[PDB]
Design an enzyme around this catalytic site. Structure first.
Site, PDB file in Angstrom:
ATOM      1  CB  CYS A 144       4.980   7.062   0.243  1.00 25.22           C
ATOM      2  SG  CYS A 144       3.484   6.457   1.078  1.00 25.22           S
TER       3      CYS A 144
ATOM      4  CG  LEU B 274       1.888  -0.291  -5.845  1.00 24.08           C
ATOM      5  CD1 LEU B 274       1.147  -1.627  -5.855  1.00 24.08           C
ATOM      6  CD2 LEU B 274       0.875   0.858  -5.797  1.00 24.08           C
TER       7      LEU B 274
ATOM      8  CB  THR C 174      17.322   7.461  -6.801  1.00 19.96           C
ATOM      9  OG1 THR C 174      17.375   6.642  -7.968  1.00 19.96           O
ATOM     10  CG2 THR C 174      18.699   7.455  -6.120  1.00 19.96           C
TER      11      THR C 174
ATOM     12  CD  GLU D 114     -23.362  -9.297   4.588  1.00 16.26           C
ATOM     13  OE1 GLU D 114     -23.668 -10.466   4.954  1.00 16.26           O
ATOM     14  OE2 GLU D 114     -23.899  -8.277   5.072  1.00 16.26           O
TER      15      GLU D 114
ATOM     16  N   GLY E  93       2.293  11.726 -15.527  1.00 10.52           N
ATOM     17  CA  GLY E  93       3.212  10.618 -15.349  1.00 10.52           C
ATOM     18  C   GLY E  93       4.463  11.027 -14.580  1.00 10.52           C
ATOM     19  NE  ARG E  94       5.866   9.551  -9.009  1.00  8.77           N
ATOM     20  CZ  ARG E  94       6.386  10.484  -8.221  1.00  8.77           C
ATOM     21  NH1 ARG E  94       5.935  11.734  -8.236  1.00  8.77           N
ATOM     22  NH2 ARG E  94       7.379  10.153  -7.390  1.00  8.77           N
TER      23      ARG E  94
ATOM     24  CG  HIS F 279     -26.007  -9.147   7.870  1.00  9.77           C
ATOM     25  ND1 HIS F 279     -26.177  -8.473   6.677  1.00  9.77           N
ATOM     26  CD2 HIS F 279     -27.172  -9.002   8.552  1.00  9.77           C
ATOM     27  CE1 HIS F 279     -27.375  -7.914   6.657  1.00  9.77           C
ATOM     28  NE2 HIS F 279     -27.997  -8.215   7.785  1.00  9.77           N
TER      29      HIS F 279
ATOM     30  CD  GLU G 135      -5.360   8.316  -5.374  1.00  8.52           C
ATOM     31  OE1 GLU G 135      -4.270   8.919  -5.240  1.00  8.52           O
ATOM     32  OE2 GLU G 135      -5.502   7.101  -5.102  1.00  8.52           O
TER      33      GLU G 135
ATOM     34  CG  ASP H 120      16.467  11.321   1.085  1.00 10.41           C
ATOM     35  OD1 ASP H 120      16.220  10.664   0.054  1.00 10.41           O
ATOM     36  OD2 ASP H 120      15.635  12.136   1.579  1.00 10.41           O
TER      37      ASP H 120
ATOM     38  CE  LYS I 287      -3.202   8.234  -1.920  1.00 10.92           C
ATOM     39  NZ  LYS I 287      -3.846   7.401  -2.911  1.00 10.92           N
TER      40      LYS I 287
ATOM     41  N   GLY J 298       2.995  12.144  -1.308  1.00  7.19           N
ATOM     42  CA  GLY J 298       2.341  10.981  -1.893  1.00  7.19           C
ATOM     43  C   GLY J 298       1.261  10.368  -1.008  1.00  7.19           C
ATOM     44  CB  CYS J 299       0.658   6.896   0.296  1.00  4.62           C
ATOM     45  SG  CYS J 299       2.149   6.179  -0.473  1.00  4.62           S
TER      46      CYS J 299
ATOM     47  CE1 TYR K 218      -1.397   6.874  -7.219  1.00  4.63           C
ATOM     48  CE2 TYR K 218      -0.708   5.701  -9.195  1.00  4.63           C
ATOM     49  CZ  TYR K 218      -0.417   6.240  -7.957  1.00  4.63           C
ATOM     50  OH  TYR K 218       0.852   6.164  -7.420  1.00  4.63           O
TER      51      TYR K 218
ATOM     52  N   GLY L  87      -4.575   1.133 -18.100  1.00  6.98           N
ATOM     53  CA  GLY L  87      -3.926  -0.012 -17.506  1.00  6.98           C
ATOM     54  C   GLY L  87      -4.711  -0.690 -16.397  1.00  6.98           C
TER      55      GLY L  87
END
Ligand code: FAD
Ligand code: FAD
Ligand code: B0M
Ligand code: B0M
Lengths: 588, 588
Positions: free
Chosen positions: B149, B436, B252, B571, B387-388, B566, B295, B132, B157, B153-154, B291, B318
């Site tokens: 991520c 993802l 990668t 629901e 974009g990436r 409920h 975000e 890495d 964020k 990333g995830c 996104y 998309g």
């Protein structure tokens, strides 16, 4: 087979049209009925598997085989020419309104199930009455239309739960960079209660508007069934009278129990009183260990109250006891005190409630623990949550012939029929069924469609998911681990499990290994998921979607092949791998 | 059939034992392998339904038909007597370490997929290296082990999303009775960044510990595949050397794109820089509409920033465009500004970033709208989210023979194999797959099991659910409505939909009819659910469980017969009834 369905539909429907989508003679009759504001059910024969057999079978009642055919309360009325004859001669309105009874349907009880049944029946042209009366609590509390969930149940308790959850949101906000000081913020009980009660008031009004706009007669009156078709009613002036109905739906629900000890009724309260209480409860004792008891203790502690729960034996009897113990352990570490293996003996009054200055009283509670030792402590408020029961002797004369069980609930067939052929029961009084608001609503709407629109679909009462809204929430669908092991044997049960930590809890320095989930599976049936259990934030939102998969027979392989959404708490279900039999730790 | 599987399994497993659960000679060999710390895969012939065929087929390799049989890198080593002989003569260690190559597996890239694949392979005795290296951004930003991520990333964020959500929790707390005043509270960016980065640092460290504890070699070096089995490595002292491996996994990932305009690389930033920025961005322009763009713009606005988004054409290209428009409408009503149908032409610098006083610079942005009118405005920070892309020329010599598509991604078979038989690719660089983190993890773990443990399960890339963590969240699983109609025709599609209001929003006086959900269904396939869409709080938690049901082929009837929990947002999916074709309003 087909013949018996059509006979049942014709005899029960109030107004029903047999039609085809393609026929302009049918379009002609539909438009007439719409202009005359005549509501009715419609069966489109060109869109049913065996509509051709039904069309021939209609002749047994009308002596014709064509379409349209219109019936009213079991009587053939006519074809296109004949219906338009009645419309042109102003004879239609009289024909469609002739009935042996005042109403096609009388619903006794205006709560979750009853209001849903009554509104759905009216959509198909049934002339409907809904009766609702709220007998006051011992201290005199009463409320409006909508039943237990709306007024003193799911709705106010989840709103007070949210007020409790926001205390920890205030704490968390400091660690995420916001400048507030949680230690200097306090809670105002009466401001909360005012906002909760304003929402409930909008629901009371919305139901009355809904009934008016469906042409349903709403009577704020106590109903009593005295014969299969006669309902005795008593209004707010104790005026007594009698109305009659073809079909009857009993939907009267339950109320809280009190224990048979001195001072309980005089000086304690129940959940019926808590949600509109005009003063903060103060130092509070909750007696009982049901989901009501624990939910209420939980938010009272999160609002800053001094709260104790007195537990006779175990928490959440009937739920998975591993998860119940985790629920209680979380509450005890976050400011709920427990008096374990303890029951009450008497409540003594030390100060009367100060109705003037908006202050509670003061009480002395005396009890004893299970080994023999004694309990004695003072509280400002004592809340009993020791179960709920119906009292159908108020509702139902024993001469009518409706069978009850040993608990006092109505014994019904799988289509909600009682032992009296025109009388049905739905909701919490239906013996053996889950006592939940969405269950009652589905039963009521589905029944109304079978009675008045010729539907056949039954309510499915199996594997109904639940959520307990304790400070850390607990969602479940299916069997507990102990029930699965008893039913199938320990060697046939595999349990996958894992702790988790919500990402939101990292920066906020909350606990690493308190949230927890498991799947209880049957080895010999392709690892079928028998039960799903999760302790964590938003547990009801997490659980709901999996209830669809369990209804369809999900296996562990179905969970494994589905990909997770990241970052979420729920995704942990898609990668479970540690088994209980392996002995490997579930911590993260 | 069976014989082709056995040959593939024996050739590529590093160390594998063919065994039966019942056999004490197999148990004796297992116990010796454990004592010498020799990790290995195990296949229990008596647990497989064609174990008898496999046992016979083994004789083609070993000349014997009994168990145990131990293999190393394609070569039969011995039965029980022979393995124990090697053990007590101190010959075994050298036998199991014999290899044509330095490593059984080299993973190029230490992110979501690569770390998952490497750790899983080592569990079955594959001698594994994970490489890495993080190429710095144009302003110099870099970070630790774990991929996009974990670092940029995830994880960061969603933590800053949570900080934004807490602003409205502070607002709501007043209406539920808490004494704070939201208008007096402000946010400190650097305090939040410090907490986010401390969590990321614990993840960097946790991964290095995990690789050490699995006996994986971690090299912080840039890798380049120069022939099928040869990886050229460059370390942080620019020392260059070559390592060899049997199997190669390319993992990668991608990095952000910049537009080709003056000033972009010199004066703007990307998401790679945002999550560790030492100063608050101030007045900010986000260029793009993915996104990532929405975000980031969303949480910056909730933290008190002045934020504008420059949109070339549409939002969330998309994704379902009805849902995309609702997402953007909510942001615009809650303080995000939008410059629609607009693109940038150049960035000019008015002030340099003030690294002493910890302050951003100042920039002039010039652009134009699609009709030709001009855009010109000053901002303190400009973030490009356009974009990436991968850049495999830095990873992969063209003479190796690995085929790429027009976008520069690797063309793979459905078992992740490239056009070079020992080389595989996973994660964002695998052409055509959803980009993802949980997809990359599943692909990596499942591939390691097929290479080194004889598994056959493939990753399933269809109907993978997603969530966009905008200020009001958007969850989805399956087709958009416009894709369903294009594929099957409008007459074969039925859409059920409803608005809803979270119970938590009632006392807080939030909006009545902004949250929304729909099911897109195929009429002629029993009303199969083709796509599910929900805009509301906790949308990822809501959506996850339904992805299992869609995987199993849920229909509208399956949603109808499942009972709701409920009170929850989720629901509402169990009682949908309004169709779009009916024209009836979805408001509640
Ligand atoms: C504190 C609490 C919290 C709860 N939380 C949840 C939750 O989160 N989720 C959930 O699913 N369920 C919850 N429940 C359960 C839910 O409230 C019930 O399952 C549901 O209300 C039962 O509906 P029902 O139609 O059977 O009766 P009810 O809603 O109780 O309606 C019956 C109505 O008929 C009236 N009535 C009675 N006798 C007569 C008569 N003779 N004439 C006329 N009217 C009469 C009653 O006064 C009442 O208005 C909770 C219950 C409680 C007590
Ligand atoms: C802002 C943002 C938010 C996101 N949010 C989400 C979300 O909420 N949910 C979700 O599921 N996904 C999300 N993603 C996507 C997710 O980050 C990626 O799909 C995932 O990280 C892909 O993993 P990977 O293993 O393919 O590559 P990566 O995680 O990118 O790892 C590749 C690694 O290899 C290194 N490397 C590159 N070249 C070499 C080389 N020559 N030698 C050695 N090492 C090298 C890279 O520096 C990197 O460390 C988000 C992405 C971004 C940018
Ligand atoms: C050892 N024995 C006692 C604990 N137990 C409970 O039922 C229980 C668990 C947790 C809490 C927290 C408060 N009250 C609780 C009772 C059964 C097993
Ligand atoms: C006719 N056209 C109008 C714009 N529109 C979008 O796709 C869109 C684009 C940008 C934003 C920003 C907030 N809401 C938005 C909607 C629908 C189709």
């Amino acid at each position: 087979g087909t013949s018996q369905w059509l006979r049942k539909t014709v005899d029960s429907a109030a107004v029903i049209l047999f039609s085809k989508t393609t026929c302009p003679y049918c379009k002609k009759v539909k438009d007439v009925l719409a202009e005359a504001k005549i509501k009715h059910a419609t069966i489109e024969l060109d869109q049913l598997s065996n509509g051709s057999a039904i069309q021939k079978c209609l002749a047994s009642f009308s002596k014709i085989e064509t379409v349209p055919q219109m019936f009213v309360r079991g009587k053939f009325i006519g074809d296109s020419q004949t219906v338009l004859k009645y419309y042109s001669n102003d004879e239609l309105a009289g024909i469609v309104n002739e009935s042996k009874y005042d109403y096609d349907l009388i619903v006794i009880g205006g709560g979750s199930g009853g209001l849903a049944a009554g509104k759905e029946a009216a959509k198909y042209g049934a002339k409907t009455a809904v009766l609702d009366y709220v007998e006051p609590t011992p201290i005199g509390t009463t409320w409006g239309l909508g039943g237990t969930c709306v007024n003193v149940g799911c709705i106010p308790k989840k709103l007070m739960h949210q007020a409790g959850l926001l205390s920890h949101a205030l704490e968390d906000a400091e660690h995420f960079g916001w400048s507030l000081d949680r230690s200097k913020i306090s809670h105002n009980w009466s401001t909360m209660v005012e906002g909760v009660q304003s929402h409930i008031g909008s629901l009371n009004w919305g139901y009355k508007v809904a009934l008016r706009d469906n042409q349903v007669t709403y009577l704020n009156a106590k109903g009593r069934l005295i014969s299969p078709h006669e309902v005795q009613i008593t209004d707010k002036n104790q005026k007594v009278s009698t109305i009659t109905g073809n079909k009857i739906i009993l939907a009267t629900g339950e109320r809280p129990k009190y224990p048979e000890i001195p001072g309980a009724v005089e000086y304690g309260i129940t959940s019926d009183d808590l949600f509109s209480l005009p003063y903060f409860p103060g130092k509070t004792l909750v007696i009982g260990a049901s989901y009501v008891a624990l939910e209420c203790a939980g938010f009272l502690a999160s609002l800053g109250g001094d709260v104790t729960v007195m537990v006779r034996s175990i928490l959440l009897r009937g739920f998975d006891q591993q998860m119940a113990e985790k629920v209680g352990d979380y509450m005890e570490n976050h400011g709920v005190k427990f008096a374990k293996l303890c029951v009450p003996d008497e409540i003594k009054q030390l100060k009367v409630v100060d109705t003037e200055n908006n202050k509670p009283g003061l009480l002395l509670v005396k009890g004893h623990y299970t080994d023999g030792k004694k309990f004695e402590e003072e509280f400002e408020t004592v809340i009993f949550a020791v179960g709920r029961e119906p009292q159908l002797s108020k509702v139902l004369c024993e001469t009518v012939g409706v069978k009850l069980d040993k608990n006092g609930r109505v014994v019904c067939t799988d289509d909600e029929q009682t032992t009296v052929s025109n009388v049905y029961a739905i909701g919490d009084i239906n013996a053996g069924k889950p006592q939940l608001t969405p269950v009652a609503i589905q039963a009521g709407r589905y029944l109304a469609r079978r009675l008045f629109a010729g539907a056949t679909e039954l309510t499915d009462y199996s594997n109904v998911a639940t959520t307990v809204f304790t400070p850390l929430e607990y969602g479940a669908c299916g069997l507990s681990e102990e029930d699965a092991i008893e039913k199938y044997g320990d060697k046939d049960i595999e349990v996958y499990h894992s702790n988790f930590k919500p990402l939101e809890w990292t920066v906020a320095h909350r606990e690493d290994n308190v949230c927890y989930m498991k799947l209880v599976c049957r080895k010999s049936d392709n690892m079928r998921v028998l039960g799903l259990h999760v302790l964590g934030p938003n547990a009801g939102e997490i659980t709901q979607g999996y209830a669809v998969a369990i209804k369809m027979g999900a296996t562990k392989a179905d969970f494994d092949r589905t990909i997770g959404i990241h970052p979420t708490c729920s995704e942990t279900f898609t990668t479970l791998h540690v088994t209980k039999k392996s002995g490997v730790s579930p911590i993260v």
